[PDB]
Amino acid sequence: MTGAVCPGSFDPVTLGHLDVFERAAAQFDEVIVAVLINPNKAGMFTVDERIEMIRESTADLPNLRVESGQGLLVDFVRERGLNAIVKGLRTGTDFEYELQMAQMNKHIAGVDTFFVATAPAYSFVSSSLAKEVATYGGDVSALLPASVHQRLLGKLR
Amino acid sequence: MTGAVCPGSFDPVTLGHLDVFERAAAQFDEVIVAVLINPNKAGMFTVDERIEMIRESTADLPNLRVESGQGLLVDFVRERGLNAIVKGLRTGTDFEYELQMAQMNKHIAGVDTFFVATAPAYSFVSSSLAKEVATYGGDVSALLPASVHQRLLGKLR
Amino acid sequence: SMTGAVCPGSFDPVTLGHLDVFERAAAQFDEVIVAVLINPAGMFTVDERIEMIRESTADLPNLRVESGQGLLVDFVRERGLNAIVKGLRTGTDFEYELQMAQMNKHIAGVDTFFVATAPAYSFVSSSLAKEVATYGGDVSALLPASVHQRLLGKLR
């Protein structure tokens, strides 16, 4: 009955994201990972690549599935009969910005947002910083799942 | 069967707290509001008074129950077969202190914490500020459940 | 006794959050000037932005609306004033605006007064309102009634 959506661009998914997925899947009957695509800007990975990397690293979460979308997150959530979003947060700065979006989403669609504190070990990994570090040759193998790391290096080379 | 604990002193419960209770009860199969008994610093209302005020304000939430608790919160949570805490947050500063507690609770007992952003209208209400304003004659009736407000005036006489 | 402040912004479009700040500034200063930045890529033209603000502030007799360019402190000083009034939502806002406020005081002796957002508008911004409306979300409760139909026009 209960369910939540875990949104992001996941370009690529990180171990921080996977931690959030696992924690959501432990507390809700179903979890949908929403891979939100900007039809106007391509990321590093195509939609099918992003989804494949997430599926490979969530194979042991039976109540989680992965779907892409675009436009308003609250429409994605509501069209699946749900009304909760779960998002990871690292800092107070994160909270202030995400707060605005959560209150807007509640206002326009009645959708609630639950935030979870990042695991300490992954508090400094982000998709953007991992890509930037890897671009200039830094070692990010411990911050990304196996389903991501060598595909990332491949994209960069 | 999903579930979460909503902990606090609730001295007294505010409309901000109630908003959190409602949103938790909408997303989890069971919610337990845990009312802290604090041996040292006593407050304005007894634990039984606080429990009754919450029960009156949550009468329409059939999957929410109210209980007193003492000591280590994660013991309270695990003793009831649960492993999630739900708390409301108002500010970035709130997030930083609560994040420390959440990471500590996950480390020592595997209990997770979900945070929800305050409804905008209650971003500035707290039990402590409401009591202080009311003590000096300010009108806080729009910030508290109807019953709380009547009981609060009683304690002040 | 010739008190006055300037309320600056791009106002693309003006929101109820902005209007709340204008009203509060107008209640505490003899003269308020809303300064609409010309910074030519926005949704509305500078003239359209000025009109929407004038429409929404008709009940504020001591407020006027003017366009401006360049250093804000020059705009303020050339009108004989030396105060800016700005609304703030978060501590993050305060830290960024703090830098600009201290710079403005340093270079021109112009002071900045910040006012806390009304709770109901803590989450509205011109940018988020435009984004939500663009994908069909209802923002009518967040914008002046006039602005709202004008926005519908730009999209449809």
Next chain:
Amino acid sequence: SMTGAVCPGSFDPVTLGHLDVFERAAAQFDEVIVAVLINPAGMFTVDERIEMIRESTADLPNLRVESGQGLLVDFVRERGLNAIVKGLRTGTDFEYELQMAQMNKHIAGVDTFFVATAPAYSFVSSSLAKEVATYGGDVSALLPASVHQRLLGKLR
């Protein structure tokens, strides 16, 4: 035209950071009242705190100093005003003061204007100044000249 604001605090003692805020408030409002809280454990008596502020604000003709108790908004409204002016150093400050500002607006319609600290006084507070002086640190550059000798008196 009857503009006015109240600058509240314990001022135990008043610092150059506070005085900077008083001066800036006095420059932008016709009338400024400094409200000195009676909250009986401080270092100086309410009378002493009032005297130190009056001594330091002699060049501010439109400022007066009064003691107060209870709800700040009652102090403000009973003097016919509905604005508070408060200085702010950090984003953390803003978040805490934001709650009080929104509460005060809610219960009494009293607005709050915040001003950014002068950079030179970003680190001074009554409490830190007292603490440092107590252990022999030189805080003379952080306090009004009058206050400084008075502080030396309380310690020696």
Next chain:
Amino acid sequence: MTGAVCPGSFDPVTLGHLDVFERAAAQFDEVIVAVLINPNKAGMFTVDERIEMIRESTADLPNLRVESGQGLLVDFVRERGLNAIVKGLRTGTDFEYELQMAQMNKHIAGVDTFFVATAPAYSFVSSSLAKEVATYGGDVSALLPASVHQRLLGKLR
């Protein structure tokens, strides 16, 4: 020639503090850990106990020594012919508060302060939170050095 002081109450020292000590000892010729004592409030551990717990967990840092003091930190620093303080920081909130003290210390004595970001794993441990959790029976064995944990449990029992 170069040197820094690492101050705190260290009541007790945590793994977060030890991380800071090690990082300071790697970058300065000498490091002094300053155990600052409030002569008006006893902590959990006496001064000699605090120093002993720090020495036992820093035995492999040859350029580090431990001394107690009270009063102005900048006097402790200057009387040893030094003029740098090194302190760990976890959050932006920490930085704002410590910033005030660092600027005051520079103002009154010319002493500089260098801050270092906490290691991610210890970002949620503090002496106060470890004591509080342990008081109510929570497991904090992974957050404190061996020189501390059982002595803490002993104090509590």
Next chain:
Amino acid sequence: MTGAVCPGSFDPVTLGHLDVFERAAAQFDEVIVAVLINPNKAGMFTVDERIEMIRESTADLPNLRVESGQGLLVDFVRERGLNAIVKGLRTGTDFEYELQMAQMNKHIAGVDTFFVATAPAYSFVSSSLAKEVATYGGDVSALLPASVHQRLLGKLR
């Protein structure tokens, strides 16, 4: 032999930067100021111009040298036999973003970062804001080294 790298674009160097350089040079045996060459986004001054402005402003710092750098900062640092970065901080928000970078740099290369709080007088100056103010005729001469100011006026004509 202790040492640290002070990295940045310094376009142009401000009195805030110089304060950081001075404080680093006072506490480390060697300081290297690393001036970023950025292939994409160019700025107002060439790398050689930026280096010369820093050299003129740091003429009294014999243990500080200035060099251009590109790519991964921790490679620059380790290539010079060092493993410390020193950066100035103005705000809590600054700390949060820089903390992510510092933890990342420590993770991928074992390079540590020490932060110093801005002198109060320069808390509001930045290269970007100084240029913007100067472009429209504002006087920023009290915020920049004397030589920078002369060169800045030249670029604006």
